[PDB]
Structure 1
Amino acid sequence: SSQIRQNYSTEVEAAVNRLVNLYLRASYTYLSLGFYFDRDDVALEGVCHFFHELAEEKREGAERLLKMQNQRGGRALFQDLQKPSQDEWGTTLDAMKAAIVLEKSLNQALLDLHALGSAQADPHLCDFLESHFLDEEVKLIKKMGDHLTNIQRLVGSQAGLGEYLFERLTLKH
């Protein structure tokens, strides 16, 4: 058992394990989003790349949380990863709306865990979230909001044309 654990509450340890599950589920959702945009009948490579990069970013967030759990002397506990909420993700607009819903839920989970750390007087936990998660999340939600606005400007009455141009002229290929 641990000879290192100090100032690390069972409540934080459990919440950190829950947050790992949320990040892994987010990674899985993005894996599904990316491959949907790779379908021959969807074929938006920039959209595929955007979600594939987010699947890797969320897996890395989960790994940083697991590394921290061991650094503090907590014990990683894994649960089932629920499959993503959809099998098909509709338009780039539908997908970007689903992504910002998902990120808002992750952000609230970070803010909840920060509040628990503050209540528990766990400044290492609070610093860890501030340093590696809170600003990364604000920057990503701002980028998704910027994308949603541009996608929405492009619908007009020529939705196909706008979806193509957004993928060609904003997203990376």
Structure 2
Amino acid sequence: SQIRQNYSTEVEAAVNRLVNLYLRASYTYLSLGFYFDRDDVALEGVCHFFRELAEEKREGAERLLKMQNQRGGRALFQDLQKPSQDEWGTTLDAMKAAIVLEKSLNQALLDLHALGSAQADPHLCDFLESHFLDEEVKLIKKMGDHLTNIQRLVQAGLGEYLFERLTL
């Protein structure tokens, strides 16, 4: 506020909503990760893949919160909604759900970028491009590649085991 410059209330609010989305995504990946650690599921490579994504999403939320403060905006937190499912089915189901999740985050990033451009806020625009847009694009490509390999593999039980052992 002594520091705030060119930082609209609209962008400030949208940044708080994006923090919530990232935290929610981290929570979803925590649930996905532990589901694959169940003794009756037991796919450790899948569990590790999702645990790593949970950490990345949390880090994304923290970078947004740091930026909110750097701009003189005020962080506001909301409840984190529990993940959409309690049980996540097969590795295939889970990877589909993850791609759906990432494309929603990506669309939220693109909406925020468009807001930033409309508000002539190039710092916000650069920030997103630099730390988030390319990371989402790479992550979604990786997930699409996984989904394609899982699909080619599913003798569904054997396929799911080999994917976990040899890719993840």
- In the TM superposition, residue 53 of structure 1 has moved relative to its aligned partner by 0.2
1:16-68, Cα deviation, whole Å (9 max, x unpaired): 00000000000000000000000000000000000000000000000000000
In structure 2, how many angstroms separate the alpha carbons of the residues matched to 1:5 and 1:86?
A: 40
- In the TM superposition, residue 79 of structure 1 has moved relative to its aligned partner by 0.1
- In the TM superposition, residue 121 of structure 1 has moved relative to its aligned partner by 0.1
- In the TM superposition, residue 106 of structure 1 has moved relative to its aligned partner by 0.1
TM-score by length of 1: 0.97
In structure 2, how many angstroms separate the alpha carbons of the residues matched to 1:33 and 1:85?
A: 11
Secondary structure of the residue aligned to 2:84 is coil
In structure 2, how many angstroms separate the alpha carbons of the residues matched to 1:49 and 1:138?
A: 21
In structure 2, how many angstroms separate the alpha carbons of the residues matched to 1:75 and 1:61?
A: 17
In structure 2, how many angstroms separate the alpha carbons of the residues matched to 1:93 and 1:80?
A: 29
In structure 1, how many angstroms separate the alpha carbons of the residues matched to 2:133 and 2:71?
A: 20
In structure 2, how many angstroms separate the alpha carbons of the residues matched to 1:37 and 1:118?
A: 41
In structure 2, how many angstroms separate the alpha carbons of the residues matched to 1:49 and 1:94?
A: 17
1:125-159, Cα deviation, whole Å (9 max, x unpaired): 0000000000000000000000000000000xx00
After TM superposition, the runs of 4+ consecutive aligned structure 1 residues lying more than 3 A away are none
Quote the sequence identity (%). Answer: 99
Show structure 2 runs of 5+ residues with no match.
Answer: none
1:98-137 pair list within 5 angstroms: 98-137=97-136
Which residue number corresponds to residue 60 of structure 2?
61
In structure 1, how many angstroms separate the alpha carbons of the residues matched to 2:109 and 2:44?
A: 31
Task: Kindly report the root-mean-square deviation, in angstroms, between the aligned alpha carbons of the 2 structures.
Answer: 0.2
TM-score by length of 2: 1.00
- In the TM superposition, residue 5 of structure 1 has moved relative to its aligned partner by 0.1
1:86-137, Cα deviation, whole Å (9 max, x unpaired): 0000000000000000000000000000000000000000000000000000
- In the TM superposition, residue 11 of structure 1 has moved relative to its aligned partner by 0.1
In structure 2, how many angstroms separate the alpha carbons of the residues matched to 1:40 and 1:104?
A: 30
Show structure 1 runs of 5+ residues with no match.
Answer: none
Secondary structure of the residue aligned to 1:134 is helix
